[PDB]
Amino acid sequence: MADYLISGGTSYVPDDGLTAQQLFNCGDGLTYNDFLILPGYIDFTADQVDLTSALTKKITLKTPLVSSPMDTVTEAGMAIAMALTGGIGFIHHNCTPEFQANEVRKVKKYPLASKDAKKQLLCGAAIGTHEDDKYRLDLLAQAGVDVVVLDSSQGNSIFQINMIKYIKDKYPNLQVIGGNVVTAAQAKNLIDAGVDALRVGMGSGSICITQEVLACGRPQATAVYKVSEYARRFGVPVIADGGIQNVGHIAKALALGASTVMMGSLLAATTEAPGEYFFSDGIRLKKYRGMGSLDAMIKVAQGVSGAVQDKGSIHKFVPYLIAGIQHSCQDIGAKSLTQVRAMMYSGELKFEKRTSSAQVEGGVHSLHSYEKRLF
Amino acid sequence: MADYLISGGTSYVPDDGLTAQQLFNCGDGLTYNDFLILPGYIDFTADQVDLTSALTKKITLKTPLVSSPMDTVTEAGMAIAMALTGGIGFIHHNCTPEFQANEVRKVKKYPLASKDAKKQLLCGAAIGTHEDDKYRLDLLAQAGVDVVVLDSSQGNSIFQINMIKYIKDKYPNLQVIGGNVVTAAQAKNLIDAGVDALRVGMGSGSICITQEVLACGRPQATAVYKVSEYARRFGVPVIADGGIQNVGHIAKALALGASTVMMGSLLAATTEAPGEYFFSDGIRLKKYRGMGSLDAMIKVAQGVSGAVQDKGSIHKFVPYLIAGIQHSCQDIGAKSLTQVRAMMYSGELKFEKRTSSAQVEGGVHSLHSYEKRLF
Amino acid sequence: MADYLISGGTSYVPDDGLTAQQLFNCGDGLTYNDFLILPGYIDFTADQVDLTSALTKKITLKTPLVSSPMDTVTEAGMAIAMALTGGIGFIHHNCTPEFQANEVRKVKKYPLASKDAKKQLLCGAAIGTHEDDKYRLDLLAQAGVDVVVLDSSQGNSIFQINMIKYIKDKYPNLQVIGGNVVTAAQAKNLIDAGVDALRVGMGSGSICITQEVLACGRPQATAVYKVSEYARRFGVPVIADGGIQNVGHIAKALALGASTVMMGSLLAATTEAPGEYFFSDGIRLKKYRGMGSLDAMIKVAQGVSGAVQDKGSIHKFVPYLIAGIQHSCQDIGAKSLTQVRAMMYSGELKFEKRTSSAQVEGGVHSLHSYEKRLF
Amino acid sequence: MADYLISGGTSYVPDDGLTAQQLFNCGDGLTYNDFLILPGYIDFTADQVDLTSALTKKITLKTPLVSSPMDTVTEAGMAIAMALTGGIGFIHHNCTPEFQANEVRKVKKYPLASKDAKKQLLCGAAIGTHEDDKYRLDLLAQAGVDVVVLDSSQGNSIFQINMIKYIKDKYPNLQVIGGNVVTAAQAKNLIDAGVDALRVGMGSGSICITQEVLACGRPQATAVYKVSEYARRFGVPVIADGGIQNVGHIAKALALGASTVMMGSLLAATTEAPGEYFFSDGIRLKKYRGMGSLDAMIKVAQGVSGAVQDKGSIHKFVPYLIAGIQHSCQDIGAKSLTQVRAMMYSGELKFEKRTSSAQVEGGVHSLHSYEKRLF
Numbered sequence A, B, C, D: 001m002a003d004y005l006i007s008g009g010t011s012y013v014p015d016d017g018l019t020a021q022q023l024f025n026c027g028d029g030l031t032y033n034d035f036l037i038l039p040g041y042i043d044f045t046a047d048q049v050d051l052t053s054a055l056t057k058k059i060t061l062k063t064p065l066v067s068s069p070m071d072t073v074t075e076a077g078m079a080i081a082m083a084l085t086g087g088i089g090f091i092h093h094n095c096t097p098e099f100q101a102n103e104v105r106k107v108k109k110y111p112l113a114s115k116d117a118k119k120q121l122l123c124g125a126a127i128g129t130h131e132d133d134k135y136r137l138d139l140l141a142q143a144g145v146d147v148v149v150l151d152s153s154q155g156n157s158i159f160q161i162n163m164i165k166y167i168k169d170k171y172p173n174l175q176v177i178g179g180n181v182v183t184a185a186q187a188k189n190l191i192d193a194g195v196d197a198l199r200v201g202m203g204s205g206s207i208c209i210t211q212e213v214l215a216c217g218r219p220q221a222t223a224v225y226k227v228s229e230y231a232r233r234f235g236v237p238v239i240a241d242g243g244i245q246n247v248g249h250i251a252k253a254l255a256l257g258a259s260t261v262m263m264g265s266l267l268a269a270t271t272e273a274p275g276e277y278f279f280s281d282g283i284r285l286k287k288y289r290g291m292g293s294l295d296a297m298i299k300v301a302q303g304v305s306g307a308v309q310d311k312g313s314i315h316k317f318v319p320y321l322i323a324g325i326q327h328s329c330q331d332i333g334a335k336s337l338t339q340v341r342a343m344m345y346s347g348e349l350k351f352e353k354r355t356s357s358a359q360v361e362g363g364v365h366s367l368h369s370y371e372k373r374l375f
């Protein structure tokens, strides 16, 4: 019959909205708040959405959530909690090598939990690009680390490329994550060096002043899309880092091509985060600082020291983030994050820009007073 | 003579401004505050403007105003007042089925008043898409409801399409309104299911945080235009829902293709609205909350609970909205809302964008102090 | 009901094709063969199409056809035949003033026939812009001429403007046609001088070499549209002159805003045209030359002398042109030429460009041999 | 009064057509036949147009016409005739140095005639860029040459720049013309070398096959405009060379920014041109060949050898070219070539493109047979 012979199973489907390709080809510098994802078709419940994601070329997680390698975010307690919730944590390196190795050992000696072949909790750690980081690399490797991230603001350098090749020659079994990068040109040199994943973001962090101090960086949404589009051609996953304020930001970063999301301030002031609580203005809060702030390190500061208010425990906050990601996937019409990215690259997923008035209308407005309770 | 033979009765009419088609084809996400309607020609007084409008394919109202189905906006008293003023009200469903049926019966047992063939006040009600909403549908039908709205944030789903077909097979006399939708693709599935009208808006409500929590939605002006343009091809009217803050917003929604306008916060803190008044900061106010807030309903909140200040009675506020709609129609040069939409689709009505500086100049500015009294 | 209240009587009407405004705003130089008129809706027979048209501000004709003022096209016999068929003829001026006055007197003393208040056939004549043309103007005025055309290749000059004001001061009853012009800038000076119509075309004539000799002119379709759009603002009709090869060209010139069409070679080699027939190559033909050729007049030639083959009598050829114009109007969906121009300016009439391959496909192609017979 | 105070003496002047800047910024490669010049306003007779033009920074001619330095175009007889008519001729160099010096001396020993301070006829000559051209330069300088052209297909070279500096150091009184160039980048190096004029054109000659053989060159109209726009910034005049087939081409080259026009085939087969006449096909003709053809000079030919038909004497042909240039200036509305270029750069002069159908309509068409006589 003609109902099938004209075009097999493909209904008319009216054209409305922009594809990611034409949204990010306007040359404008877009942030997460500058656009939205148009709704699709629903034929499943939100509990049937799969959040399985690739951290690297051969490391798979149950959820796309990762903890940032900072001295006010990730130590053994945070790493254990993130591994148990189905994600992972990267331990910071501004301590001594012996201390970081002991923290990794505490994580390895401990339903959706991320584990290895030996049934131990997965753990990651950060290192620098100086010659003394090779002794630190050896201690982290003997402690049983599974994945390592080369931590830098600008990762397209001779020092990082030399470090990547040294690790690949000495430890062929270790997964190496390069970064930070914000352009396809920077991503090419690191993929050719032999990295297993990429870290994306420059100046987008809540405690980062790099864009005002050094005049270098890029808006986070366009950087994630551009780097992910290039890295997809070689099977290399992208970690979206910096600028996440709510679960809607996480859903946007994943829909633009990222495979996992790394967060700082969102996980700051939680029970498992390093440092103790203190009171001010009648409310509880905890310290949060940038690794490039003068406190954390002739010297030019690229970060600030501050505080965020109490958030509870990650064993109660991560399941809320999971439920929000699944509800966002159900609204757009995809049964998994893999399907979301597949329909994004095929042009089936649609987007729309927002003006300043559109953002004002989208947020809470025109009320005398209100309470904003998330869960 | 040549004054008529060159072009019959069509004067030169200088070309200035943009048509709705070219305003909403720029791909930008426009809100009501982002544009204006250019003035036309006046040959009648504002008292001669007709506001007759279609709620559905076969339900007509004297005015285009509707009350939102919320537990802080519409119960029997609000529905009676809106029906008497020439509009209609949709009773909320977060109560028990027996209670909602009794509230509809109060409205049915009570110059521009919206009435049926039996001369009783018109009344509407909302239902969900779960299998137990069928017993609620039966009680609402026996109570004498005239029109029913399937209440959901994203209405392009298997559950809503199944519910629409069940209602059409069982109650061929009942009018069914689908929604919420913001794209022509979503509107097509519901029009093919057999709906009688569409509800448009997603994340534009004053108490809505859906765009920030789930990253899904669309700016209200472009969504209303795009859905109305598609729904006009099948004789299906559009109800504009969310983001109405003043009578200028109502006039813009009607001029972009909507046939009726739904409002929750504009009618909140009125005498007929549910809940009692209370004092704070030396002024009177009433509670107003989103149906997706934690108070109104593992759980992800999509709304907030708050309060708005006193507004008086709708028997004095609705005639003010009517007078403002008529004055706006006289300024643009149309004798009825039907004529406004006809000249909008023909390209005769013209529009212009506003920059941020244009919005600042358009509002009250450069005064030490002032009093803004509407009526 | 909603079928009328959404938009009164205006059906959806799918958008396809370009309006004249957007076709002639591309900046490209378009000729009649570069575009087509898209078909419309038919609710009448071709015999019900009215071809009434304005020659000037107060002279109306039954058909839009006019004879060019050339010594191989228009004398008393051609003027009588065009007047009897419902059009008009302009007598050439390269003869002596006494001869042209006698030729006008023959026309004045001779169903759709174009006549004056005294029931005599309407007649027109051409003059130059030199001081001796004032004595010629007086003889033509005493002979009873009704309309006069100032014949020049470039009519935006001090000499033509002085002549127009002299005629208006001396003969307030005489109609004056200015030209030739191809731009709105040239048209403004002549409309402000006080002309009653405009003549449009420069270098588009079949016997014209002005574009190759003087590098000045414009493609005929864009020139007619641009001049007619400006002249419409003052109630001044436009005569389309030069480049007409078939009835499809006549229909295009009228649809682009012209009120009448002037033709040379199309009416050449007819029985009523001046000069006798002669044989060559076994077929009959008649001489046709440009007024700027060396034969018709230190000296720079802007025209050529040649010949075209026999065409029969105009009493048999004009009714064929009338039937073709009416069939073209029926195909596009208009009951009169006035309606055609009214729907062209309103944007309801639609157009499409043609590539070189499109013109090859549109003409007769892929045959070994054929006979092309018009009527 | 308001008629002067609103905008002093500046009338409305409707905007229609393109400026040269926006015509040549489309990126398309345009030839003289691809566009036209729109008509302006006439307040003078064609006999009042001044054709005075600058050949170099300090050599002025009565007419803008120059003879090309070819062995079938310019020798003493042609140079004397062009000097007497108000232009100049450049003697070819494919002969011996002694012969070229004797031809220059014949010209120097002989109303609008181009002369020097000593009242002798102006004369020019061509040379190459090899070391042997320095002895030739000395002989030409002693013979009394006034201006010299460095003859090459591509003049942006180290050999030509060295030759220009040698001539400026040795003969500060001699005028030096560089070329050929078609881009502003090439023009900059020669203007910085110290040239007094530029020669523009590459592959546009009637006998030139450089574009098909070497794949290098540029369309002549865009090359003349682009080189003239840049050379105007330093007071350096441009000579337009190649592609001139009629007086309309001459008017276009002058209106696009050139100060003088150099022609080959247009002056070929004239009485004063070198070589004797011969008969073929029943008509008289003379040989014309490119300097890069195998006959005129391991070897790659860039020119062809052929013949063109008889043209009469230049003493009757140059006055025809002068009359045509003056008529073209009167049609566009300028009293001199200086005014034409001034209104071209100010945006007051307007242009329009031509499609292939527009060129077909602009030329002679739809005739059985005709004769095209120019004067």
Ligand SMILES: NC(=O)c1ccc[n+]([C@@H]2O[C@H](COP(=O)([O-])OP(=O)(O)OC[C@H]3O[C@@H](n4cnc5c(N)ncnc54)[C@H](O)[C@@H]3O)[C@@H](O)[C@H]2O)c1
Binding pocket: A128, A129, A130, A131, A151, A152, A153, A154, A159, A180, A201, A202, A203, A204, A208, A210, A290, A291, A292, A302
């Ligand atoms: N946008 C961001 O992500 C961002 C920006 C700024 C800072 N930071 C944070 O601040 C910390 C510091 O960042 P960073 O980029 O300065 O780290 P880094 O180690 O790259 O900085 C040290 C500097 O020394 C140079 N250097 C590196 N290796 C070297 C070697 N082997 N020999 C000689 N010179 C060498 C580098 O050019 C670098 O600028 C990081 O831990 C990072 O988390 C982040």
Ligand SMILES: NC(=O)c1ccc[n+]([C@@H]2O[C@H](COP(=O)([O-])OP(=O)(O)OC[C@H]3O[C@@H](n4cnc5c(N)ncnc54)[C@H](O)[C@@H]3O)[C@@H](O)[C@H]2O)c1
Binding pocket: A042, A044, A045, A046, A330, B128, B129, B130, B131, B151, B152, B153, B154, B159, B180, B201, B202, B203, B204, B208, B210, B290, B291, B292, B302
């Ligand atoms: N933009 C908006 O208009 C908006 C957005 C969010 C919330 N709200 C308000 O909040 C309230 C809740 O909105 P909602 O969209 O969550 O309502 P809903 O009933 O659609 O939500 C329940 C969820 O369960 C699923 N579901 C629905 N029917 C089902 C069935 N038969 N079987 C299995 N699963 C089913 C749906 O996917 C839906 O997300 C509404 O009353 C609405 O007024 C409005």
Ligand SMILES: NC(=O)c1ccc[n+]([C@@H]2O[C@H](COP(=O)([O-])OP(=O)(O)OC[C@H]3O[C@@H](n4cnc5c(N)ncnc54)[C@H](O)[C@@H]3O)[C@@H](O)[C@H]2O)c1
Binding pocket: C128, C129, C130, C131, C151, C152, C153, C154, C159, C180, C201, C202, C203, C204, C208, C210, C290, C291, C292, C302, D042, D044, D045, D046, D330
């Ligand atoms: N595209 C065309 O329509 C076109 C082009 C060229 C020629 N022609 C035909 O050739 C004929 C000649 O055309 P034309 O434009 O040369 O006519 P014309 O009378 O304008 O030409 C005479 C020239 O003398 C000048 N002149 C005019 N009046 C003058 C006065 N009072 N004092 C001093 N100088 C004056 C004008 O500048 C004009 O160029 C026309 O009859 C026309 O039909 C037509």
Ligand SMILES: NC(=O)c1ccc[n+]([C@@H]2O[C@H](COP(=O)([O-])OP(=O)(O)OC[C@H]3O[C@@H](n4cnc5c(N)ncnc54)[C@H](O)[C@@H]3O)[C@@H](O)[C@H]2O)c1
Binding pocket: D128, D129, D130, D131, D151, D152, D153, D154, D159, D180, D201, D202, D203, D204, D208, D210, D290, D291, D292, D302
């Ligand atoms: N578009 C044009 O105008 C064009 C194109 C091709 C040929 N022509 C004609 O053909 C003739 C030959 O043109 P041409 O450009 O080949 O002349 P030319 O003298 O530049 O050619 C000789 C070649 O030798 C090289 N050369 C030049 N001077 C040199 C030096 N001192 N030492 C070493 N090498 C040197 C150059 O690269 C050049 O390609 C010209 O007279 C010209 O009129 C014209």
Ligand SMILES: O=c1[nH]cnc2c1ncn2[C@@H]1O[C@H](COP(=O)(O)O)[C@@H](O)[C@H]1O
Binding pocket: A068, A069, A070, A180, A201, A203, A204, A205, A206, A207, A208, A209, A210, A241, A242, A243, A244, A262, A263, A264, A265, A266, A289, A290, A291, A292, A293, A302, A303, A304
């Ligand atoms: O000092 C700093 N300046 C700028 N960026 C930093 C600095 N320290 C850490 N970062 C980045 O900030 C991210 C955390 O950003 P957040 O989630 O917005 O709070 C980290 O993962 C790093 O990429």
Ligand SMILES: O=c1[nH]cnc2c1ncn2[C@@H]1O[C@H](COP(=O)(O)O)[C@@H](O)[C@H]1O
Binding pocket: B068, B069, B070, B180, B201, B203, B204, B205, B206, B207, B208, B209, B210, B241, B242, B243, B244, B262, B263, B264, B265, B266, B289, B290, B291, B292, B293, B302, B303, B304
């Ligand atoms: O909890 C919620 N979140 C988001 N939108 C909601 C929620 N509850 C109701 N809505 C919408 O908000 C509209 C009222 O918008 P308002 O008049 O601008 O305040 C209602 O008609 C619903 O479409």
Ligand SMILES: O=c1[nH]cnc2c1ncn2[C@@H]1O[C@H](COP(=O)(O)O)[C@@H](O)[C@H]1O
Binding pocket: C068, C069, C070, C180, C201, C203, C204, C205, C206, C207, C208, C209, C210, C241, C242, C243, C244, C262, C263, C264, C265, C266, C289, C290, C291, C292, C293, C302, C303, C304
């Ligand atoms: O010598 C001439 N050169 C250029 N155009 C001319 C000349 N003589 C007449 N014309 C124009 O040619 C038109 C006729 O063009 P045709 O209908 O294509 O044959 C006349 O009405 C004049 O506008």
Ligand SMILES: O=c1[nH]cnc2c1ncn2[C@@H]1O[C@H](COP(=O)(O)O)[C@@H](O)[C@H]1O
Binding pocket: D068, D069, D070, D180, D201, D203, D204, D205, D206, D207, D208, D209, D210, D241, D242, D243, D244, D262, D263, D264, D265, D266, D289, D290, D291, D292, D293, D302, D303, D304
């Ligand atoms: O052999 C050749 N090939 C290409 N161009 C040449 C050659 N010889 C001369 N030319 C150019 O041709 C111009 C003359 O072109 P014409 O006026 O179209 O015939 C000369 O002034 C040179 O710039």
